[model samples]
Target: HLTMPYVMPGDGEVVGVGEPVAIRFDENIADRGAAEKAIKITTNPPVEGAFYWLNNREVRWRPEHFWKPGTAVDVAVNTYGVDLGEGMFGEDNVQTHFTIGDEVIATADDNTKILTVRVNGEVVKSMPTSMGKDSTPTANGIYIVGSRYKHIIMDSSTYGVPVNSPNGYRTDVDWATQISYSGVFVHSAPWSVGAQGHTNTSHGCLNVSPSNAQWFYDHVKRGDIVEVVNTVGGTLPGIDGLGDWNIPWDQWRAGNAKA
Candidate 1:
């Protein structure tokens, strides 16, 4: 008997540009290489992207750049009866489709301590900002705005450091937007007002005025691009946050097991 697999961004679901196609199998496949080869994606007008195996039973596909506004994507997993090794074969094939929404992009320069917000290619706002200090510099790379929160506790302990440690901090954050899973965010920092445009003094976040943070919180959406530049700390890894855009087109394509 065959079991149906679970596909994320389910059929007809609308999602942000940063969203990736994810599929999970009921049974572990012995030949991930063959399994990867059985899957396919088609975009109206076509776009460049690649798939990466998250595990033996799961995989995800993302585009080379943030998806264009209002684009359609179709996915097909034609693995029924295909050998997956270990005497296991796909039970059934699966298919799904999704669409992208509006486009938004924010660029932050660590060296200049400025942030520029754009929507649909037009500059919307230019604001003073503060990034990480030299000791714990912000990561430079392209990222997707993964989530937003009105109020949340920012704790260094969550990242493995004890709260009482010299570098540890536990505080309340407002109008926060998540840029990375590693605790990097663009959030309101009232205490850092004096240094907002003059110095890099944060742990690794992009500190903005409360008013600007609220404005960002109101306008930013999931899948929006957030590019950080000129940070001595270096770029983020492809798997970190929505760093998928950081991968070069050729390298991204090479990651596809099917290719």
Candidate 2:
């Protein structure tokens, strides 16, 4: 029997509005269309969305816009008895149900160095922030919120820069919320408080006060929207976390993009 597919958002999990649905298989499946069609997405109120293959083994689906808060999403990968490709047929089915939580959007501005958190369109918190300096600017785009970490050790060497080098340093942090897979996060930066609103001074991650960082971590969940504006950095890629909102709707609809 073929290995069953692995799915995400764990059945019964509650995700944010911008969450991307994923269906992953252990073996490569060449019948891209068939594999995609087999995975049925049923949402309350029927939101319009489409899929992009992150790779032959994985595919993700996202609504055209940030999903409506309180949306109900159900994914059924009924691949059993269907040929996935290369004469390989799935032996089991997969299903997951996750509801969309309240809409949360954190908009960070580079010039103002302010991070504003809004829930359901109303401003809730505005935090002084310090993003990457001119040398390493933060990407400008909407990032799908990732996991939360009460404490984390950040190392520049992990992303290719050496810790002992002039622009490298490892530091311990608290209340870190992942915003991108390429090591970008909105985390506590107690030391940078002096420059939070006055200037950009970190190595790409958005730096906020420890108190504000904890507030953000406590309120946000996976799939929330994080937007970085007025930054000179290039656009973030979808492959880097769920930057799917960065992809133009037309481009996403065209399909065939790989991570």
Candidate 3:
């Protein structure tokens, strides 16, 4: 006998508006295409979205846009006793429900070197910021805020820069808000205070004052929106850095194998 797989945003969970629905299998899925077809998500207000395979054992679902401030979501994965090809079979059926909390959104503009924050659709705060340098510009697109770290060691090596290279750096950052899988973040950069709002610096992150960054860190929740704009570096890819929101409704729906 095998343990049944589970879906995330677990039953009765309450998550942020940007939260993505995810499922993980106890065993590798032999037919990813088939598995995707068996999963379903029903929202109370009827939203448009699609599923994306994160790996053979996991898949995720996100709406074409951030979920409305408050909404309910139900997920079902009906694969019990079903053949999954390659001699694997579905362990059991699964279902879960979750709710979306309040809305928090931020807009970071490279051209203006500013970050404007909003809560429940009303502008609340604006702060000076320094984004990526021309050589390594910040991506322009919508991102969902991921994890939060009060302190972290930013390493260039993790992103392909050799530690010994002149451009490489490894330094501790404060109040970091992760916005991309590619290492982009909105964090404190006291050293860049003079340049923030006047010019772009750093590798490819939004740099703000320690106090401002902390304020952002304190208020933001997982799944909040982070929109970047007017960057020479171009828009982010749909699969990178919570880029799910960057995809248009038509393209996002087309990504579903079952569509």
Candidate that would win on TM-score:
2
TM-score of 3: 0.88
Task: In candidate 3, list every pair of residues with a backbone clash.
Answer: 180-241, 181-241
Q: After superposition, how far is residue 245 of candidate 3 from its true place, in Å?
A: 1.6
Question: What's the lDDT for residue 114 in model 1?
Answer: 88
Q: lDDT for every model?
A: 0.82, 0.87, 0.83
Q: Which ten residues in a row are the worst by lDDT in model 3?
A: 250-259
- Residues 100-207, candidate 1, lDDT per residue (tens digit)? 877778899876788999888899998789998998888899887877999999999999988899778788999999888788899999988889888988888899
List model 2 lDDT by residue over 98-137, tens digit each: 9999999999998788999999999999999999888888
Q: Give lDDT: candidate 3, residue 105.
A: 83
Which of the predicted structures, 1 or 3, would earn the higher TM-score when compared with the native? 3
lDDT tens string, model 3, 26-91? 776767777877888899788876887655677778877778867899998988887766868788
TM-score for all models, in order of appearance? 0.83, 0.93, 0.88
Estimate the TM-score for candidate 1: 0.83
Clashes of each: 0, 0, 2
Alpha carbon deviation, residue 1, candidate 1 (Å): 12
Q: Cα lDDT for residue 201, model 1?
A: 85
